[PDB]
C-alpha cells in the first residue's frame, strides 16, 4: 500500500 | 486522502485472463477467418478503440458472434488477445508485420507504436 | 521472450470503472440494505472471494440481484466496491470499523490487512 | 515497454  | 494498493490492477487483470482461459462469463466469440476466440466483451472495449466502437453501438452490443475483416490474420489477433489479458505481448520477427496490421485495425495504439519502433530499428 | 506494457493493467482497469460510471454491460445489481450497486460480476470475481464463490456456483452465477447480509454497512460497500474498480482506498478514522468488517464478509485479505494495521497503529 |  502507497499514498498515491 | 485515498491510500492506493500498487498490485491490484495486475491482479484484477490476472484473475480476468483464468476466467478466459476457464470460459467463465465470456459473453461473445470473435471469428477470424477459420478460428475462433471467446472474450470478455468489457475487456475488449477497455484494449481495442475497435471493440470499443462495436459494443457501444445500440445493435451491436447485444451480438454473441462478431465478425473480423478477411484480410485479419488469426495469429496475429491471437497474440493481441493474450496481451490484452496479460499486457505481454509476444513480438517476434516472424509475425510483426501481422501484429501491427492487427494492432491498426484494432486500434491498439501503444502496440503500434512499439511495432513501428521495432521495425525502424531492423531498416 | 515477450516485452510487456508497464501501464497496460492500469489502464484496463480505468476503462472497467469508466464502463460502470457509464453503466454499460453492467450484470448485476448488489443490494446492501436500502442501497443498489451495479457492477460487472467478473470484476467483482477479480477481486472478492465470496463473488468469486458465488458466480462460479451454477445457480447463482445466472442471477441478476444479489442481496448481501443485512449486517453489511451500504458506505463500506460502496467503499470497497470504489476499490475493486480503481486500486484506491477511502479508508478513514470514520469509516475504517465497517471498511475492514465488510472487506471480511467479501474476503479481500489485502484490504483486511491494512485495515489491521491501521487499527493496531491507533491503539 | 520493458523486458519482464
Ligand atoms: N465506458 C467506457 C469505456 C470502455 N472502453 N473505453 C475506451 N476504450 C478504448 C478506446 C480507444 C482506444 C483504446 C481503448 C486503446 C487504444 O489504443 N485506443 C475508451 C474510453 Cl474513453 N472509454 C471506454
Ligand atoms: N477463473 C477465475 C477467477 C476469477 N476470480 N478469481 C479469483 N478471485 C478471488 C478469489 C479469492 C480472493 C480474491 C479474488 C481477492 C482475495 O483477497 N481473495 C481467484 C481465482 Cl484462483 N480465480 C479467479
Ligand atoms: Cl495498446
Ligand atoms: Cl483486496
Same mark, same amino acid.
Given at each position: 500500500?502507497?499514498?498515491? | 486522502? &485515498?491510500?492506493? #494498493?500498487?498490485? %491490484? !490492477?495486475?491482479?484484477?487483470?490476472?484473475?480476468?485472463?483464468?476466467?478466459?482461459?476457464?470460459?467463465?462469463?465470456?459473453?461473445? =466469440?470473435?471469428? =477470424?477467418?477459420?478460428?475462433?476466440?471467446?472474450? %470478455? +466483451?468489457?475487456?475488449?472495449?477497455?484494449?481495442?478503440?475497435?471493440? /470499443?466502437?462495436?459494443?457501444? $453501438?445500440?445493435?451491436? &452490443?447485444?451480438?454473441?458472434?462478431?465478425?473480423? $475483416?478477411? @484480410?485479419?490474420?488469426?495469429?496475429?489477433? &491471437?497474440?493481441?488477445? $493474450? #496481451?490484452? /489479458?496479460?499486457?505481454?505481448?509476444?513480438?517476434? @520477427?516472424?509475425?510483426?508485420?501481422?501484429?501491427? !496490421?492487427?494492432?491498426? /485495425?484494432?486500434?491498439?495504439? %501503444? =502496440?503500434? $507504436?512499439?511495432?513501428?519502433?521495432?521495425? +525502424? !530499428?531492423?531498416?
Amino acid at each position: 500500500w502507497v499514498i498515491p | 486522502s &485515498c491510500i492506493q #494498493f500498487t498490485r %491490484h !490492477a495486475s491482479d484484477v487483470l490476472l484473475n480476468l485472463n483464468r476466467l478466459r482461459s476457464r470460459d467463465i462469463l465470456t459473453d461473445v =466469440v470473435i471469428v =477470424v477467418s477459420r478460428e475462433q476466440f471467446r472474450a %470478455h +466483451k468489457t475487456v475488449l472495449m477497455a484494449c481495442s478503440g475497435l471493440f /470499443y466502437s462495436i459494443f457501444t $453501438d445500440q445493435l451491436k &452490443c447485444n451480438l454473441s458472434v462478431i465478425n473480423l $475483416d478477411p @484480410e485479419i490474420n488469426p495469429e496475429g489477433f &491471437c497474440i493481441l488477445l $493474450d #496481451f490484452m /489479458y496479460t499486457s505481454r505481448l509476444n513480438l517476434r @520477427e516472424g509475425n510483426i508485420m501481422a501484429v501491427m !496490421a492487427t494492432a491498426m /485495425y484494432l486500434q491498439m495504439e %501503444h =502496440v503500434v $507504436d512499439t511495432c513501428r519502433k521495432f521495425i +525502424k !530499428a531492423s531498416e
